[PDB]
Amino acid sequence: SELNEKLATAWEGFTKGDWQNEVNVRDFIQKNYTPYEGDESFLAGATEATTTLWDKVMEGVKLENRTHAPVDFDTAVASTITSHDAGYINKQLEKIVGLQTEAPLKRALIPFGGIKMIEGSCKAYNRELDPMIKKIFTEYRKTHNQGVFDVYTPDILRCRKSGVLTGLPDAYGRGRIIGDYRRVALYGIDYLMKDKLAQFTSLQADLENGVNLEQTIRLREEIAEQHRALGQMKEMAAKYGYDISGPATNAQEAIQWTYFGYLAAVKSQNGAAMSFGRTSTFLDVYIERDLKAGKITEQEAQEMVDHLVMKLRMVRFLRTPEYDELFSGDPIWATESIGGMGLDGRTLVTKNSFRFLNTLYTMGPSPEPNMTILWSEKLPLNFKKFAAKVSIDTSSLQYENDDLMRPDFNNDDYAIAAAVSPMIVGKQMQFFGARANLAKTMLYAINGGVDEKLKMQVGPKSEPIKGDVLNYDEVMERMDHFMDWLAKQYITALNIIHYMHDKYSYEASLMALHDRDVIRTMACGIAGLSVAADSLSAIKYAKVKPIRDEDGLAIDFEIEGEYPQFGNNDPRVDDLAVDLVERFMKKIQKLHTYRDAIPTQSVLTITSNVVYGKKTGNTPDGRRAGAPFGPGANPMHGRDQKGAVASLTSVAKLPFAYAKDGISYTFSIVPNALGKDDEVRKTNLAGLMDGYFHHEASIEGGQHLNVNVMNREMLLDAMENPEKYPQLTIRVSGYAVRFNSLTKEQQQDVITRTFTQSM
């Protein structure tokens, strides 16, 4: 009889299902959500409390952007789930509470990942690290950072320094984990703890029988840590005057409970991406019930959502300047997956879908949360148009192919982690791997493993390519070999990293909100795809002559004739890009991985396009030394000149089947290119996306799309006059940032990118 007296009271009115007898958030959603096909006319505006709160927080935000530094941060407190006291912006006004530290925007110290990065941050921002904290995390509690560097090979160190394998998660939280925070709201902590205890007990037999001994012992300890973490969540919430031992009884509690689950996560881990999940529709179930019972008004519903979202706009992590160049714009990737279609055919779009998007209006444009629209051609036209409208007005949204991912998973409850990495909520995670420099790998092939800037042997010692003119078949053959080498060094580095991360910074509070067994993938990223593809194209269709120095190192290239560049829908070059994605995937696929994580690939870079570009010399495609690579899977800056449909088609050709961790594309189009008025623009934008995401048995389609609707002139004005654009937000690589949050160099990359002038 799985139904307590309190569970029945909290679930009064809800439709029965397996979800009442076991942890199954998906079933609860399926049996209870109300599909919405109407428009945005019901949306309410911001309340005075909301505006007062947000305006106060924006003062800290302006300070952050102006100083390019934290407003404040801990120097003597080691952060945990229960370390800090309750903190508020204004307790009398907040409907949803919870801050990482005791003060708005004050960043914490998460030492378990490594003390050296904290020291770097302290010195960079002019603050003194407490000596006791330093001592503890250098002599008593070994950290992730130290575990990794103790096992690294000198080959990996060389790759890190030369810029072929740089920025891997050896100096920051790996992230890429989304605990199902909805579970706290649905079941309450006590129920989840009892479920974890059962999971723990289910491993006893194997333990005693010596079946997979070490793996069993590891999992039991992890589950024990998870159980303990759940208890700490209650203590954390209690500091705020809340008792979350039982299930949420109303809308407010559902939102608060879910957020508390996430709060424990961001108080204990500092993953590069700390995503929210697929929660908007789930929360709609509680909002609908309260509206129907007349307990809450529509404006009050918006306020609750605004306060939740406002908190997500306040997540912060103490990062080093080095991290800042790899992941620019003070990002969090508090990703929310909105809408999508169910497996049964109905849309997963709800009124809450609109409420979340509406936060861009009630509180203005914002980079976080990273609101992602799960697009499908079958979505209600009303929602398609409104999403497009929000993009045109704010450039704060990203779109990802639900018509491609839903069938691939055969699940309608997956969420987007970080930028473009899909996972079934509570049943899957990824071992983050950042990205590798594919372009530099090509130069190594031509230069016999000798780095073109450092002039030292990095890759395998081999003969450099001879001849005054480059030959496609030879170059591709040598590149294929060096890709084997890159694959081995990359997987080896990640194997070490994740072994140490599980050991020294196991994400207990997040894993506590997952099933007993979690599917894991080893996500390998590729940077500079278009630089490599175009370089090969130039070599194949034009006449590329290497300019070598006294030692025979190719330090420049002279190109005779023009050649097809990626992004112009010319198969001659696009097939090469497709080929590269396929090649690397087949290589990492054959290698052994830690905890048997299934290797996956992503054409994603984040700000590595700038960092690797800065460390890569002249390339065969004509790109000059030090120049930024294209963001993610984008064509090189300004090379896609045949309009929107053409560039979208090239990117869509890229095989998601060989890049399951995602394919990022940052698309920027001028207002007039979409139409003369908003109605035409909305219709056209939605149309562009329907074509890009069009999925058929013979046509895979695009996976992701960042959408910026702006004029380059506007950004130029923002560069000169910051104070005039406090909340100006733009998509840059698989997330958004406030334009004023970037450095001058980072902004330089953004303004020199392709601004689509026509369709």
- Chain positions contacting Na ion, by CB under 5 A: 652, 656, 700, 703
Residue placing its CB nearer to its own copies in the complex, 71 or 136: 136
Q: How far apart are CA 219 and CA 216, in angstroms?
A: 5
CB of 135 to its own copies, least distance (A): 9
- Number of residues forming the site for its own copies (CB under 8 A): 36
Contact between 76 and its own copies by CB under 8 A: the answer reads: no
3-state helix/strand/coil string of 177-192: CCCCCHHHHHHHHHHH
- Beta carbon of residue 630, minimum distance to Na ion (angstroms, whole number): 17
Interface residue with its own copies, options 213, 547, 680, 716 (CB under 8 A): 213
Closest CA to 607 of 370, 329, 315: 329
323: Cβ–Cβ under 8 A, 6 or more apart, which residues? 117, 171, 172
In one-letter notation, the amino acid at residue 508 is: A
CA distance 734 to 632: 8
Distance of CA 261 to the CA centre of its chain: 19
Residue 598 backbone dihedrals phi, psi, to 5 degrees: -70, 115
Rank residues 207 and 625 by Cβ distance to its own copies and give the closer one.
207
Residue 207 engages its own copies in binding (rule: CB under 8 A):
yes
**In sequence order, what DSSP letters do the residues of 391-437 get, joined into one string?**
HHHH---EEEEHHHHHHHHT-S-EEEETTTEEEETTTEEEE---EEE
Q: What residues from 498 to 537 belong to the interface with its own copies (CB under 8 A)?
A: 499, 503
Q: Which residues contact 715 (CB under 8 A, 6 or more apart)?
A: 730, 739, 747, 750, 751
Is residue 136 at the binding interface for its own copies, with CB under 8 A as the rule? yes
Q: Which does 147 bind (CB under 5 to 8 A by kind): its own copies, Na ion, none?
A: its own copies
Centre a 10 Å sphere on the Cβ of residue 103 and count the other Cβ atoms it contains: 16
> What angle in degrees, to the nearest 10, is found between the helix axes of 678-693 and 381-394?
110
* 3 state DSSP class of 523: strand
Please report how close the Cβ of residue 153 comes to its own copies at its closest, in angstroms.
Answer: 5
CB of 572 to its own copies, least distance (A): 37
3-state secondary structure 265-332: HHHHCCECCCCCECCHHHHHHHHHHHHHCCCCCHHHHHHHHHHHHHHHCCCCCCCCHHHHHHCCCCCC
Out of 43, 77, 151, 719, the only residue in the binding site for its own copies (CB under 8 A) is: 151
Rounded to a whole number of angstroms, the minimum distance from the CB of residue 679 to its own copies is 58
The one of its own copies, Na ion, none whose footprint includes residue 153, by CB under 5 to 8 A per kind, is its own copies
Q: How far apart are CA 114 and CA 110, in angstroms?
A: 8
- Which of 200, 180, 175, 185 minimizes the C-alpha distance to 268? 175
Residue 495 binding its own copies, by CB under 8 A: yes
What is the closest distance, in whole angstroms, from the C-beta atom of residue 659 to Na ion in the complex? 8
Q: How far is the CB of 650 from Na ion (least distance, A)?
A: 10
CB of 239 to its own copies, least distance (A): 16
Q: Which is nearer to Na ion, 523 or 718 (CB)?
A: 523
Asked if 747 touches its own copies (CB under 8 A), the answer is: no
Nearer to its own copies, 260 or 594 (CB): 594
Nearest-approach distance from CB 73 to Na ion, in angstroms: 41
The least CB distance from residue 504 to its own copies, in Å, is: 10
Residue 495 interacting entry, from Na ion, its own copies, none, C-beta within 5 to 8 Å by type: its own copies
Residue span binding its own copies (CB under 8 A) among the ranges 202-210, 301-309, 388-396, 516-524: 202-210
* Residue 58 found at the interface with its own copies (CB under 8 A): no
From 346-354, 470-478, 484-492, 691-699, span contacting its own copies (CB under 8 A): 484-492
Structure tokens at 604: 């994603």
For residues 217 and 657, which CB has a smaller minimum distance to its own copies in the complex? Answer: 217
Residues 6+ apart with CB under 8 A from 524: 433, 435, 436, 490, 491, 494, 584, 588, 599, 600, 601, 602, 661
Q: Which is nearer to its own copies, 89 or 494 (CB)?
A: 494
Task: Report the distance separating Cα 430 and Cα 599, nearest Å.
Answer: 10
Q: Return the closest-CA partner of residue 366 out of 58, 64, 97.
A: 58
Which residue stretch of 55-63, 306-314, 465-473, 491-499 sits at the interface with its own copies (rule: CB under 8 A)? Answer: 491-499
Residue 139 binds: one of its own copies, Na ion, none (C-beta under 5 to 8 A by kind): its own copies
* Least Cβ distance, residue 592 to its own copies (angstroms): 3
Give the shortest CB-160-to-its own copies separation in angstroms: 15
Q: Residue 591 touches which of Na ion, its own copies, none (CB < 5 to 8 A by kind)? A: its own copies
Min dist. Cβ of residue 313 to Na ion (A) = 31
Contact 390, 360 (CB under 8 A): yes
Residues 252-311 that bind its own copies (CB under 8 A): none
**Interaction residues for its own copies, span 568-607 (CB under 8 A):** 591-594
Residue 466 beta carbon to Na ion: minimum distance, rounded to whole angstroms: 38
Taking Cα atoms as reference points, which of 419, 364, 391, 393 lies closest to residue 686?
A: 391
700 binds, among its own copies, Na ion, none (CB under 5 to 8 A by kind): Na ion
Euclidean distance between CA atoms 474 and 477, whole angstroms: 5
Q: Which stretch binds its own copies (CB under 8 A): 137-145, 392-400, 673-681, 697-705?
A: 137-145
Q: Six-digit token pair at 559?
A: 């190109």
Given a contact cutoff of 8 angstroms between Cβ atoms, the answer to whether 608 and 167 are in contact is yes
SS3 call for 75? strand
Q: How far is the CB of 226 from its own copies (least distance, A)?
A: 11
Q: Which of 32, 80, 376, 437 binds its own copies (CB under 8 A)?
A: 80
Q: For residue 91, count CB atoms less than 10 angstroms from its CB and return exposed for 0-12, middle for 13-18, buried for 19 or more.
A: exposed
The span of 39-47, 145-153, 473-481, 734-742 binding its own copies (CB under 8 A) equals: 145-153
Cα(294)–Cα(124) distance, rounded to whole angstroms?
Answer: 53
Task: Give the contact letters, 216-255, x = binds to its own copies (CB under 8 A), - = no.
Answer: -x--xx--xx------------------------------
Lookup: tokens for 404: 């491609």
Question: What does each C-alpha distance from 175 to 113, 548, 559, 632 come to in angstroms?
Answer: 12, 43, 43, 19
Q: Which of 2, 5, 128, 208 binds its own copies (CB under 8 A)?
A: 208
> Residue 678: is it exposed, middle or buried by C-beta count within 10 angstroms (0-12/13-18/19+)?
middle
Residues 6 or more apart from 719 whose CB is under 8 A from it?
747, 751
Residue 77 touching its own copies (CB under 8 A): no
Confirm or reject binding of residue 147 to its own copies (CB under 8 A): yes
- Min CB(461)–its own copies separation in Å: 16
To the nearest whole angstrom, how small is the minimum distance from the Cβ of residue 213 to its own copies? 6
Question: How far is it, in rounded angstroms, from Cα 501 to Cα 588?
Answer: 21
Q: Give the residue with the Cβ less far from Na ion, 334 or 663.
A: 663
Binding mask 95-134 for its own copies (x = CB under 8 A): ----------------x--------------------x--
204 binds its own copies (CB under 8 A): yes
Taking CB under 8 A as the binding criterion, the range among 24-32, 115-123, 210-218, 725-733 that sits at the site for its own copies is 210-218
Closest Cα partner for 184 from 235, 260, 238, 251? Answer: 260
656 binds, among its own copies, Na ion, none (CB under 5 to 8 A by kind): Na ion
CA 576, 581, 585, 587 torsion-angle sign: positive
* Residues binding its own copies (CB under 8 A): 78, 80, 111, 132, 136-137, 139-141, 147, 150-151, 153, 204, 207-208, 210, 213-214, 217, 220-221, 224-225, 488-489, 491-492, 495-496, 499, 503, 591-594
